[PDB]
Ligand binder design. Structure first.
Ligand SMILES: O=C(O)Cc1ccc(Cl)c(Cl)c1
Length: 167
């Protein structure tokens, strides 16, 4: 049993809700919240900007020290940093950004990072401003992630479209 409420069950291990991931994280305080990061951990917009704003920029401060020490992530890669006030940990995962011309084929690699954590609160990788087809992203998620993932979809109309079209 866990603290996630009102999620629709898609598969054995994947659940989905129309929710703001920031508000979800603040309510649940999951062990792991996933950030839809870029390789520089520059948390400007989208989920990253929203999570970082909710940490009062502490996520960005920590991230800048991480990059200064380690250099950028890979597209498809991840790192574990603090969850600050939102979660125990934040798993920063870099899905490909189609609007930057990155290879959509790296989306599966990005979702494989979730398998290192038993339970996660996450957004749909590579959807929204990342420019990928969200139906595709959900399919890759369910076909790749084996651990328990609670997907928080911000856009209402998108949530309805994802559920109605799910195979
Ligand atoms: O939750 C959504 O509505 C879809 C989505 C997923 C990722 C990002 Cl970064 C964004 Cl902006 C939106």
């Amino acid at each position: 049993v866990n603290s996630f409420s009102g999620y629709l069950k898609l598969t054995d291990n994947v659940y989905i809700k129309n929710a703001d991931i920031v508000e979800e994280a603040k309510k649940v305080k999951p062990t792991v919240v996933v950030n839809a990061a870029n390789v520089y951990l520059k948390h400007g917009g989208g989920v990253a900007g929203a999570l970082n704003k909710a940490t009062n920029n502490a996520m960005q401060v920590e991230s800048d020290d991480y990059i200064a020490t380690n250099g950028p992530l890979k597209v498809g890669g991840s790192c574990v940093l603090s969850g600050h006030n939102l979660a125990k940990h934040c798993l920063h995962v870099v899905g490909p950004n189609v609007n930057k011309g990155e290879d959509i084929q790296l989306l599966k690699s990005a979702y494989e990072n979730f398998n290192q954590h038993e339970v996660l609160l996450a957004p749909l990788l590579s959807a929204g401003i990342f420019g990928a087809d969200p139906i595709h992203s959900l399919r890759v998620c369910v076909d790749t992630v084996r651990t328990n993932v609670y997907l928080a979809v911000f856009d209402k109309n998108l949530y309805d479209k994802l559920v109605s079209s799910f195979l």
